[PDB]
Amino acid sequence: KDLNLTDAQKQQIREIMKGQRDQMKRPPLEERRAMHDIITSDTFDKVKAEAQIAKMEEQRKANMLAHMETQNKIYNILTPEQKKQFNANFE
Amino acid sequence: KDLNLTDAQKQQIREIMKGQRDQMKRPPLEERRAMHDIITSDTFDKVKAEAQIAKMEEQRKANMLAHMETQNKIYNILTPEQKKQFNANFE
């Protein structure tokens, strides 16, 4: 992402990235303990991990989604000469 | 991670990682290329986005699981005192 953007662009991104972080709630505070709990055990059991993971589906699905909305929206702030250069770096 | 572990661990950690991190297959072209082709689109196709996220979920599941399994195999190769400070890190 270095397409010689203008002094209007970066700030428009600023409004959407603050839409990509906050409102789009990222942290469940007790599950980051769970991961710890399963790894920090001397005896490993898959089902304990299998059934923690998929509780982290609602959160990680709704994220991937929300993120794509925002990164699309920045694409749409671009110009034809800028959209060009961005597309090609993906390759 | 600077537990002051032995030469043997530094090596066992290396062959645990290369043991099953080469058991989880990394990102696939048509799932990846579309992840971004959804973004470079003219207008954010919502419905469409949800369907990629899914097609990508189960495969991603086995990649979180193997991760935790190797982090446990790594954990289970530590001793009492170093186990006490790794836990104290995240806490």
Curated annotation (Swiss-Prot), chains A, B:
GO terms for cellular component: outer membrane-bounded periplasmic space. It comes from the Bacteria. The keyword Signal applies. Keywords: Chaperone, Periplasm, Signal, Stress response. One of its GO terms (molecular function) is unfolded protein binding. It is found in: Periplasm. Homodimer. An ATP-independent periplasmic chaperone, decreases protein aggregation and helps protein refolding. Binds substrate over a large region. Belongs to the CpxP/Spy family. Has an elongated cradle shape. This is Periplasmic chaperone Spy. It comes from Escherichia coli (strain B / BL21-DE3). The gene is spy. The chain holds residues 53 to 143 of 161 of the full protein.
